């Protein structure tokens, strides 16, 4: 198994580090800037030795070293104009070198960039995905667990839609070790105002990390990606929210959007859960924005 | 941190093995049969070396080697003969390691956790039995199989005895936060299929026995270890375990399988709002545990 | 997609399954001849997996045809004469069902039984091995680390070849510092080291005499680490039963020796021995050769 | 109740936190002088924790008094003149707030900065150390394993001396699964010229990473620190090369320098192995430089 990291910045490097700790595969660290992937590859090699990992690591500036890659993680970029061009190029490269790879897009804007990759990849839509939902879900589930003074380990939630202010958090589909969130407002352990406070924090978390750390989150995104890698390689069928190809699900077809999905051997597959009309309405507006910003994107690339 | 296994049979040995794999603490393997814990201790030590674990392991037949234990895992036994064994372990824990968190495993479980309380005189929050997590594990695994998904995020509350008056709450079953109800709506699983799964979960212990000619060992050990983990690392994880109810679910002054958080200071019950058919099934379960527990204490004299 | 087939679902095979699940090595096929035993243990491992968050497929079966295209084979099936018959049958089954699997034999007597597997499997010799040396090495390295009041983690040793072990003090080191340096500084004695050697020689029997059962956890861990090295193309250096082909003056026999395991199987390594280092080993290699031909004769 | 206090929340300190979370070593305090950085990184590690099922508490602070009663201290604070300023202040703070912590200094120049910390903390000398040898050892053993086409897992080596240009790698104390390196030169599987090449690479590895990645190694240093943390907390007695207080060992007195040591409950304890005269010579001269640059250091700080 060869895991190709297209982009060897902060997120790509920590994905490699975590793919080594768990023995997921050999690493290809690719970047456009000479020297950066070679230096980080050497560091990961010594890290590997210290911790008893024997996987192969190669830092390269030559994209043809992506050949027969089973996994692809795209963080290449720095936005809609400059990253879309980069994403188109990587897309073409993935077609002629590693057409049978499972592809996890990360570059922002996410839901826009996953569609750009699809249009120019000619890859199957089930073999393509973006990571967003798991990061929003984790922040929401952590904030709920803190207030309920419980471990986050068994706090579960569905959050539909794009990675931004077009989130759709489903309180209906939130549970604490199988006990719905409702049961906790019932027992006056949490209030609806507190839950809506938590939702806006979840919506603003990306910007809050940036304002404090003067840099976008890296560790949590890397962990989300690694778990999507894991799900695919080990045919796990785990249920995530991800950018995924809808095909009639939630009244939408022919667009990658943040949705519920299974990841396994054959890729990322949407799941349709029964929504209210206010749940499906908010989501359709969310899906509409992604549709308009994606076609503006395709045109700006001209 | 010293983790004391009172009973070095099939389950106790795998608890040690798993607490070594995760570096939970030093092990004291105690048993009544001479030589058995010493032999198994040596094996776990070579196992430890092979995989790079440095925790100390001591196999002994001397119960006084239980002193200052932080964790206690009781598998000692084979209602009459195990309850009198459990009384002895209880007394031993009283004078040697009174401030230990205690995880009872010996069967019948909810009966034996009460036996331990009566004779240990330990605080009620420092005592527990493992049952619910093992039943929950079989139920959620069977649900995940039918729904063609990973079990990893299938969660469920199961109240009551570790037996054939289990109370599985379909209301409190969810798949990555989505209630099971949503899956019967979309016809991905049926109510009869779910009642299949319930009778299977109730009969799994006997089916393992009837197939393997031995009671389950790995899954129980894993359930115990996760309760050990929750306590040592102050995790506040939400399990179903045997726990001291005191008004919760209309029951007071009895250990029974219930919802609880485990942390630093022990095992703490949580009362969720049940229907009356949910609370009725549970109260009858709680009634049997109360009747068999007083039956139990009687045969021990 | 990686399939790990356990031929034998007793104490060792069950713990090998458990450990390959904990480490996500692959899907499991638990095979046994006794009806119900692998099905029961498979169910237990499934619930164990759920508790610990492992998603691998688990199949308990009594039909050997379910071992098809297995990448890994772990043979614990048995109970001298009668285990060889069992091993011959397992060998034939592996050629018809899973001919390109890497094969780790465990059933005793070990060096005799892996040779039995070779004669009847028609498998390549590099794809076959038995687990022994790692268990003797670990016990020796554990006892040394205890005496030196050090972690075992970086105590390494070569032991070639039961009563016919070859512990090489010259090839013993503590994080790269030879054992030599520790007797120099009066931290351990030559008599202490020879006591430790005999404890290592007698460890199997005393575990039996104390626990009234042969070791299971440590053997399972040794096997899992050979499984690991093969699947992840690790090239780790073990002592195991391995096919010698001129190495150490011996050819055409599986014997306990130094080997690297990788993608391509188990491959002997020849280190430079003195002459009674090689002399003692040649007697050991002679013992395995006579009892192996004794074995093949008793099997008819 | 184990508290791991990271004094410095840059690249190395952040990955130390991440790795002590993956292994459940303790709760984290991320301290830094720059407002917002530790708070932001703490949030990221918290969400990282949720995704991977870790429940240990993490707090990012700009208030140094928040390291109180810490069991572990990892000092990466800095950027000889100005970092000695920082290390003296950190030293004083550790004295009055967490005097019984085991202290792992990382800021460089390492062997110089560990002595600075000792002078102004007055902590017990067995409770103070710097991480260097394990990073040099890993690079050397990695390069040896590559040549010999073997797993690095059982390549072991002693490297004495400063973390710089006068390292002292002991081929005598190099072994492959217990077999000395010499046995491989006999078998013509490696040459001494190749081994001296490997030594020059090991000596220059830090600068080579810098020139390629335009940033110092982070992953491997963090892993070295974490395993030193591990050895201490779990009373492991593992044998490392670290900066440690020698007092008569190797003809050296009253100075922290890279040497062989056991780490356990009670701290870091030197071990003296029998060296030849060429081995002890090369070591005394490195030890001489560390002494001269440490005396330069103490003078520059006033
Ligand atoms: N979807 C999420 O939830 C999540 C969360 C936070 C950030 N983001 C986004 O993920 C992306 C990655 O973040 P990061 O920390 O890794 O950024 P980074 O700067 O640290 O790394 C990006 C790398 O891509 C490289 N690059 C640029 N052009 C390239 C090309 N044409 N081919 C190959 N490589 C190329 C850059 O040299 C750089 O090394 C960012 O756009 C960020 O905004 C995603
Ligand atoms: N709580 C649950 O959900 C659940 C599930 C499975 C098993 N069980 C029960 O857990 C118990 C242990 O299972 P096991 O496989 O490990 O049994 P085991 O026979 O293999 O080990 C029990 C050990 O306790 C020893 N022992 C006997 N008397 C003793 C005494 N007076 N003091 C100390 N030790 C003593 C025995 O010699 C034996 O070594 C069984 O009763 C089993 O039915 C409970
Ligand atoms: N190489 C070593 O260092 C070492 C160390 C310890 C044990 N051993 C040996 O490993 C072997 C297994 O040990 P164990 O405790 O796990 O044995 P076990 O009895 O507990 O399990 C062996 C299984 O093989 C099964 N079996 C029997 N006949 C079979 C057949 N014809 N086909 C398939 N399966 C069949 C048995 O039913 C049994 O379930 C023993 O021979 C033991 O002596 C080797
Ligand atoms: N010991 C070794 O073997 C080895 C190897 C590599 C790196 N280093 C050194 O380890 C140290 C850390 O490396 P890094 O990548 O993490 O550096 P970094 O710049 O990325 O992070 C250091 C942090 O210390 C902070 N800081 C600055 N001044 C401070 C003060 N007065 N008090 C508290 N904090 C303060 C900075 O804001 C910065 O965030 C560096 O000196 C590095 O050069 C040592």
Residue numbers in the entry:
A (entry chain B): 2 to 79, 90 to 313
B (entry chain D): 2 to 79, 91 to 313
C (entry chain C): 1 to 79, 91 to 172, 175 to 313
D (entry chain A): 1 to 79, 91 to 313
Source paper text:
Malate dehydrogenases are a group of multimeric enzymes, typically self-organized as dimers or tetramers, that reversibly catalyze the oxidation of malate to oxaloacetate using the reduction of NAD+ to NADH as a cofactor. The presence of an allosteric binding site at oligomeric interface allows the development of more specific inhibitors.
In addition, the atomic coordinates of the loop R75-I87 located between helices α3 and β4 sheet of the catalytic site of chains A–C were omitted due to a lack of electron density, caused by an increase in local structural flexibility. Similarly, disordered active site loops were observed in the NADH bound form and no electron density is observed for residues Q80–L90. Eighteen identical residues (G8, G10, L30, D32, G40, D71, G84, D89, L90, N94, P120, L146, S227, and A233 with D147, R150, R87, and N119) cluster at the N-terminal cofactor binding domain (Rossmann-fold). Overall, the three independent oligomeric interfaces of PfMDH possess a buried solvent accessible surface area of 3481 Å2. In contrast, the AB and AC interfaces represent the key contact surface for the oligomerization (1811 and 1309 Å2, respectively) and are essential for the biological activity in vitro.
